[PDB]
Write a protein that binds this ligand. Structure first.
Ligand code: NA
Lengths: 130, 116
C-alpha cells in the first residue's frame, strides 16, 4: 500500500497512540482498570477520552443488561457513571489505574466489556469475567 | 453551546444497519473521524447466534467495508437529519437484542436499544 498522507484528515498522533489493558478487577461496584501506554504519545486529555462499559447489573436481584457511557472527573472518588485516573499524565512505557464507578454491582459469573477511547482516536476493548 | 443527537429511525437490510440521526442541539457536526461508533448485537456466525461488541471506523466511502461506517452528509446541522450507515461483520441473528452507541466528537452521545 501507499504511505499514509499526513494532512488535515490524519494526524501522526493517531498512528502513534496505543493503549492496552493490563488487568481489570472488581470491588463492589468499582472497576479498576490498569491501563498501559504502549505508544509514543503522552496521554493527558482525559476529558476527551470516551469510556463505555457493558455488563450485567444486579438490579434488585435481577440480572439486567447494562450498557452506559462514563464521564471523566478529576475527583478522586467519582459518583456513579463517572470515571477517573490516578495520574495527570500517562507517559509511554508506564501504567495507570483507571477507576470506573458502576451504577450497580455486577451480577456474579457474567461477562463484561470495557471500551476505552483515547482523545487521539485509538482505543482498546477488554472483554472478560469479573 | 450544547451538542445533542437523537435517533429518528433504525433500519436493516442484510448486514447494513441504517441509523437516521437528528441534530437537536446548537452545534454543527462534521468532524466524523472524531466520532466513536460502537455496536453490540448478536451475529449469525454459521447459524450460531453470537454476542458481538465492536468499534467501527469512519470512512468517506459510500459503500463501507465491514467494521466501517459512513454518513450521507458532509455536515449535520441543527434541525436536520442524516443517515449513519454501519456495515456489520455478519447479518444479525433474527429477532435479537442490539445496542448502538454514537459518540460525537464534542463528547455528548446517543444510545439506541432495540432488536434487529
Ligand atoms: Na434467538
Amino acid at each position: 500500500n501507499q504511505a499514509q498522507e499526513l494532512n488535515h484528515e490524519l494526524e501522526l498522533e493517531q498512528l502513534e497512540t496505543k493503549i492496552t489493558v493490563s488487568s481489570v478487577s472488581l470491588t463492589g461496584s468499582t472497576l479498576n482498570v490498569v491501563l498501559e501506554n504502549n505508544g509514543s504519545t503522552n496521554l493527558y486529555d482525559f476529558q476527551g477520552f470516551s469510556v463505555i462499559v457493558q455488563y450485567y447489573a444486579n438490579i434488585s436481584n435481577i440480572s439486567t443488561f447494562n450498557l452506559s457511557l462514563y464521564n471523566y472527573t478529576k475527583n478522586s472518588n467519582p459518583s456513579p457513571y463517572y470515571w477517573t485516573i490516578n495520574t495527570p499524565l500517562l507517559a509511554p512505557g508506564s501504567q495507570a489505574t483507571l477507576t470506573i464507578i458502576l451504577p450497580y454491582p455486577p451480577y456474579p459469573n457474567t461477562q463484561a466489556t470495557v471500551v476505552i477511547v483515547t482523545n487521539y482516536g485509538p482505543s482498546v476493548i477488554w472483554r472478560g469475567s469479573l
